[PDB]
Amino acid sequence: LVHRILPVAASYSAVTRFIEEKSSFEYGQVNHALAAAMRTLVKEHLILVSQLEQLHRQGLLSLQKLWFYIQPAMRTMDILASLATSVDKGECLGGSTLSLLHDRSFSYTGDSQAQELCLYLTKAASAPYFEVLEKWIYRGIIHDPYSEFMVEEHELRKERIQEDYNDKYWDQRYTIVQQQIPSFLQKMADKILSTGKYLNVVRECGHDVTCPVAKEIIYTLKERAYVEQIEKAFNYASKVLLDFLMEEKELVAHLRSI
Amino acid sequence: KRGVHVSGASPESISSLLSEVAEYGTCYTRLSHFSLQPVLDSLYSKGLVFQAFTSGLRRYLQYYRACVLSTPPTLSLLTIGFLFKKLGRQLRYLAELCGVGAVLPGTCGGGPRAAFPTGVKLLSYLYQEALHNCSNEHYPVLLSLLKTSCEPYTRFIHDWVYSGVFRDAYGEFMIQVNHEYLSFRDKLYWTHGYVLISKEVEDCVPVFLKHIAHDIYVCGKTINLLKLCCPRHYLCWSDVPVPRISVELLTLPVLMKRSITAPLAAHISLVNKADYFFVELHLEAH
Amino acid sequence: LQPYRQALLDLEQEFLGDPHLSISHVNYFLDQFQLLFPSVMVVVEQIKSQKIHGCQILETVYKHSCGGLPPVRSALEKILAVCHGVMYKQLSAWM
Amino acid sequence: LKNQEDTFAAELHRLKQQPLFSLVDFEQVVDRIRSTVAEHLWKLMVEESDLLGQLKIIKDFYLLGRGELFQAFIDTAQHMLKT
């Protein structure tokens, strides 16, 4: 019975080590949030052990009772330890450890005891990435201090300057990354790059391409509101594109004088 | 553990009573192993629905363990077994419901290792057992297991009914989607399509009734088609406003559970009116 | 048959209470079932012998519901209520 | 057609709960329900799917209630039926 109770301790120490090692700056912004929302469950585990110790103080707890008492938390710790092991094993960072969290939520679809945990981890870990996507979608800036966001900006001005030989803005300045796509936004991946690349060629010229409203975006499972959000921003930005190319750096006179 | 022939204050009858309690014990251990074995995140052999089944079973096992705990520590020898008779037979029945529990009964070896159905086969097998054993005392357990087990298929239905998104891992869902769709042409749909109205010949009369077996396919290909064409005023992907996701132990017979799955017809009708061939695409003009 | 189980249970409790109890005491406390069990035996026996089919079991128990033993009558009445359960249930679909 | 299905399910449930079989209340529930359905059934056929018209068509064609049409049919298809 001791041996049958012990797997939660093996699924406690390995759980803590994950949270200590992948809190460093190097592993990226989303791997920080995953362990940062995983440590709260360790606090709640400690809270459980406090109550069990008090009952043990009053001589009113037995090993056979402790068995049933610890069953609800054993499952949570098993899910967290397996997810931690997989995130470590794949060397997943950025969106590669935002796709795995979305897929594991599908994996348990009927359970509802481990499922709710998995959605809570994905909601917690998707907060920074959706902030970067909000910035990218509603303004041309890509803050992205670490290489995690799917869209990337090469400093291709070095070669293309004075004359834009390559048409870099439309060709190879603002480009996409493949392995850092969240696997739930893959349907919108190209549209996103288009959405913000369109913004940049007016945000670069001084004229301000502001949105009507910068709708905050957050992950949700079974609900695709972000999908329509991405279309909404794409539509309006693509509309202001003619509100630049015909207003400042006016194309009509330039074509006439060609 | 048993005492045979010489024993310490244990005439044979005591051992026999311990032997029935032992039968209950072996059934608990086997069933606990069967349900305990989790998905492991790579359960290719079984399905998502089997994983849901095991979860619900574990819920019951936890309750049974709780009653075992709630037994007083100080209780008389005969009284323990008489107290636990009903739960013992209930659990042995539950064991025989699954192959694993049925196997290793004590009257036969572990060699048979009867194959447990998975997928639509499992769901349908559970429902026919529900009809067979509706009236007996054991029926609440079956109802609870079925309620939990059906949920994955309801969500599959939702995803390819209100949306056109095609999603599966092991292809236990009857309606099968392939990559030949991705070529986006007129041929390759003799290859794509769907498994027959019955999975092979194994129809799920419980879920499909043979009624929505075709209709789910029709609405799915319709929504996926018009949506593929372009966002239109009525749907425009998920722009449709707030569609409710929906999808005596039973005072009515068990077959009435079709009433819960009835609302699908609403989206079917809205789809057929919204039409895609006729008014949207101007097929008559072509 | 459940009250027989409970009766034997209460006996064991009282024997825990007292370590020297005559067999006559057991005879007393169990003598009410001494009459009920033989009565139910023929009810099962006719079903086995005559291979009674379907609803005819309902009649078979009903005709022994006229037994002149009130306890036997009530006991069999419970069983008929249970089986009328299934009959009413099958009627609850077709009707 | 009306969904008193649940209500009569409740009635039959109480009938389950009663300890001893009462032929009178069993007869009552089946009849009263057999009045909400077995009787209300009559009104449904005669009104929802009017039988008067159906019987009228049956006499009009099986029983030569349409004299002009049947006489004309004989006249037009005389030779074909004769052969």
Summarize this structure briefly.
By secondary structure, chain A is mainly alpha-helical.
Task: Provide a descriptive summary of the structure in words.
The structure is cut from a larger assembly and holds 1 copy of chain A (258 residues), 1 copy of chain B (286 residues) and 2 copies of chain C. Chain A is built from 11 helices and 2 strands, in the order H-H-H-H-H-H-H-E-H-E-H-H-H. With 258 residues, chain A is mainly α. Chain A has a two-stranded antiparallel sheet with strand order 1-2. Chain B is an all-alpha fold and 286 residues long. Chain B contains 10 helices and no strands. Chain C is elongated. Chain C starts with a helix and ends with a helix. Chain C has 5 helices and no strands. Classes of the chains: A mainly alpha (258), B mainly alpha (286), C mainly alpha (95). Chains A and B meet through helix 4, helix 5 and helix 10 of A and helix 2 and helix 6 of B.
Element pattern of chain C in H and E: HHHHH
End-to-end Cα distance of chain C, whole Å, is 34 Å
Largest interface, counted by CB within 8 Å of the partner chain's CB: A-B, 22 and 25 residues
Q: How many strand units of chain A? A: 2
3D shape of chain A? elongated
From the alpha carbons, calculate the radius of gyration of chain A and give it in angstroms. Answer: 24 Å
> What is the number of helices of chain A?
11
The beta-strand count of chain C equals 0
Keywords, separated by commas or semicolons:
part of a larger assembly; 4 chains; A: two-stranded antiparallel sheet; 2 strands; elongated; B: 286 residues; mainly alpha; 10 helices; 50% helix; Gamma-tubulin complex component 4 (chain C); Gamma-tubulin complex component 6 (chain B); Gamma-tubulin complex component 2 (chain A)
Produce the secondary structure layout:
The structure is cut from a larger assembly and holds one copy of chain A (258 residues), one copy of chain B (286 residues) and two copies of chain C.
Chain A lengths: L1 H4 L1 H15 L7 H29 L5 H27 L6 H12 L7 H11 L1 H12 L12 E3 L14 H6 E3 L12 H15 L21 H21 L5 H7 L1
Antiparallel strand pairs in A: 1-2
Chain B lengths: L11 H25 L11 H23 L6 H21 L1 H4 L17 H13 L6 H21 L52 H18 L28 H4 L2 H10 L2 H5 L6
Chain C lengths: L1 H16 L5 H8 L2 H18 L5 H9 L5 H25 L1
Helix pairs in contact in C: 3-5, 4-5
